[PDB]
């Protein structure tokens, strides 16, 4: 979804993977807030009680039971955090039956999309190019540095598998709401998967540096119904 003006927290999710990511982050924040509160409280006690005091306890310097209790407690926190992280890492992926393939080639300062299916006997394969609409040519109501002239169209409730490469330099395919972020190196093919649960318009931007115009390279994904997808694919 689109960024909000005074944002404080994540964008809205449209895929199970981003929901798992949000749940994991909100799980870790628990222990992080606990530790920060403990440290701040001890600093407050030190400032409020022992500030410019007459008695100095210069003979408490060793400790033996207490030193085992700030080396075992933090370990348990790390294990508790690491359980759900490993479960999420191994569980979520394209276990069964991917349903579509879209090649997203990243050239210097624009994008190229190819649909690996819908092939005729002669190689009629549907493909197009996505550029950024300049500020001078914008119509009333369009977003600046995020609106394109050609946008990817996909159905709802269908697994989409993205194969990402590059032709000039190292790029990054990123749509925040969908939880998709892979690189595009010049000599390998990377792949991810996404499932969209609701209809709408989903915006994204590049991440890795590529040169002069790194800030004008948006990505726009629409999730139309199946009837509209069938009509659109029979027009291009």
């Amino acid at each position: 979804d689109v960024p909000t003006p005074w944002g404080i927290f994540f964008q809205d999710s449209a895929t199970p993977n981003m929901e798992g990511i949000i749940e994991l982050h909100n799980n870790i924040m628990f222990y992080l807030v606990l530790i920060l509160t403990f440290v701040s409280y001890i600093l407050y006690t030190i400032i409020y009680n022992y500030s410019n005091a007459t008695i100095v306890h210069k003979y408490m310097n060793h400790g033996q039971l207490i030193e085992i209790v700030w080396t075992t407690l933090p370990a348990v926190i790390l294990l508790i955090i690491a359980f759900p992280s490993f479960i999420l890492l191994y569980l979520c992926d394209e276990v069964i039956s991917p349903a579509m393939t879209i090649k997203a080639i990243g050239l210097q300062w624009y994008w190229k999309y190819e649909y690996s299916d819908f092939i005729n006997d002669d190689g009629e394969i549907v493909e197009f190019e996505s550029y950024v609409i300049p500020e001078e040519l914008l119509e009333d109501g369009q977003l600046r540095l995020l609106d394109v002239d050609a946008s990817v169209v996909v159905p709802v409730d269908t697994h989409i598998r993205f194969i990402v490469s590059s032709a000039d330099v190292i790029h990054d395919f990123c749509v925040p709401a969908l939880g998709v972020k892979v690189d595009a190196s010049p000599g390998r093919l990377n792949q991810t998967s996404a499932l969209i649960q609701r209809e709408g318009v989903y915006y994204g931007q590049c991440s890795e540096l590529c040169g002069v115009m790194h800030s004008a390279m948006p990505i726009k994904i629409e999730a139309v119904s199946l009837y509209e997808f069938i009509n659109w694919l029979d027009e291009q």
Partner: protein, 100 residues
């Protein structure tokens, strides 16, 4: 590892062998830096040690440390009712009676 009955003997022995004011203040300063408040017997030796070295400010500043070491005010007023004949023979006056 040290017990109360060994602390309150070792510091008596140390207080009975100071020979100058620097040593008296050294022994007092390393005594009020433990978890144990000094017993009334040790402070009885401290005042005689401050009398042998001939110092007045140290005999009054000792009583101003018990007020900060003791947890409550009843204990402070109980320390001042057993160390009363030592005070009224030497002549030591507390700070709140001088208004320095």
């Amino acid at each position: 590892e040290e017990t109360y009955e060994e602390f309150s003997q070792r510091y008596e022995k140390e207080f009975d062998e100071a020979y100058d004011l620097f040593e008296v203040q050294r022994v007092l300063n390393n005594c009020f830096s433990y978890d144990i408040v000094p017993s009334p017997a040790v402070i009885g030796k401290a005042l005689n040690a401050c009398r042998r070295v001939n110092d007045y400010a140290t005999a009054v500043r000792v009583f101003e440390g018990l007020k900060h070491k003791v947890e409550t005010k009843e204990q402070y007023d109980a320390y001042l009712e057993e160390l009363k004949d030592v005070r009224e023979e030497l002549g030591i006056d507390l700070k709140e009676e001088l208004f320095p």
